[PDB]
Design a protein around this ligand. Sequence first.
Ligand SMILES: N[C@@H](C(=O)N/N=C/c1ccc(O)c2ccccc12)c1ccccc1
Length: 330
Amino acid sequence: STGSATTTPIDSLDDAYITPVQIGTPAQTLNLDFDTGSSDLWVFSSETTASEVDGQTIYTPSKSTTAKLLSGATWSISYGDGSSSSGDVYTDTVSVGGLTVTGQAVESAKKVSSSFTEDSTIDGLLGLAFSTLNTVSPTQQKTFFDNAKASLDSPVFTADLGYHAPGTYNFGFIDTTAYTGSITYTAVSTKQGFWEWTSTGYAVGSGTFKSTSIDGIADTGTTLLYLPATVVSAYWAQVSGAKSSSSVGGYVFPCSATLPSFTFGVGSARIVIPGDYIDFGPISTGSSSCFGGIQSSAGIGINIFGDVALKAAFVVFNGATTPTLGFASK
Ligand SMILES: N[C@@H](C(=O)N/N=C/c1ccc(O)c2ccccc12)c1ccccc1
């Protein structure tokens, strides 16, 4: 089997991407944030504290003839950015772009933190990291991909995120028309539960490539590119007037600037992020100071290849016996 679904930016900045997902019988379609940096499929629901719902579409398990309460199971997740959610668990039929999993754990939110409430466009998360990170207790549950994998034509999914435009998540096949050149595969460590890999270096604009190992995670659920302070300083030094602002929380730059590209290495291959991808617009409405799309990972404890990086590539998440990651230009 295979599946293919379009993923759409939630706003004009590509702050996140949403993908429609069918849950239950008859289908209830929710727009979920596909997140390769977490492993819970959770949704706003009829159980969510009323004051914490503000425009989201909700899953109502009582209206699904295939929903079954998973007795005694609860979940609670705290994301790296400080947001959180928790609740109980159903199993139900879940379909993405034509690919169906029966008995998928659908985690129903009873509580969500303010950032989730304040974002009306995201109805929940669909985790695509390794199932070892799943938070359901006392019996850990599998991700959608883990459940589907055996049925797929090939045990893979691909992320093809657009810049200020829709893109695609495919399951079970590689669309050879969706990229240029070849796909370069690189090793993955699954020890921490993430798609963790090692970039071979970087370049700023037309500058020379610096060969250096940068360990990080491929994370579709993170907006920006977080890299070591040395690398980030080298990038912003090329932008007149750019500075790190403690009050704003990162590098900012004049909105009048034309930004240089940023290249990252995948083995001997190179992925080029155009300068425009690195502009995240005014720091506050009407300001002429703009927020940078490349930021320091110092303090995070890990480098994060988020959407800024991933959207410059066609990315293969290879879930074979030994997982790997593939990157192609597009
Ligand atoms: N901006 C990311 C983020 O902060 N991810 N953090 C993931 C994470 C970090 C550290 C952990 O220890 C985890 C453990 C299990 C699952 C996820 C995580 C994000 C993704 C989806 C929703 C909110 C926020």
